[PDB]
Symmetry: C3
Subunit: 53 residues, 3 copies
């Protein structure tokens, strides 16, 4: 019996971790699609954004 | 601060849902771009990541 | 061993920021891939989803 406001924190962490999974997969999807351009980061000529878990 | 923590949770929750919308849309975009390959997950040859709730 | 909550909020916020960066970059990637169609949103014939302010 704890979790007073941390119940919203736990649900959010679940959402974040899950969303990250989708985002990273989307990133792999984009890097796959833009392999000819060296990946999506290179294709966009921008610094690469990574997950930090 | 307590009230600050509540506000932080509130905004972050709103940020999560907003981001999730962009992510899901990006996912639909990727699925469209790889529809012929069965979607981005099948194209990626990976277990698909979903974001529900 | 005290106040993990307040700290968790900051950690989560940065996680969201980090993720948003990837998501936005992915969106730019998708818009680039569908530039001829006016971006992924228009390519998907959907209302564009955006990140918070
Ligand atoms: Cl994404």
């Amino acid at each position: 019996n704890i979790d007073t406001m941390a119940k919203a924190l736990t649900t959010m962490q679940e959402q974040i971790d899950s969303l990250a999974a989708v985002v990273l997969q989307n990133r792999r999807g984009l890097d796959m699609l833009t392999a000819a351009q060296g990946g999506i980061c290179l294709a966009l000529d921008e610094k690469c954004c990574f997950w930090v878990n």
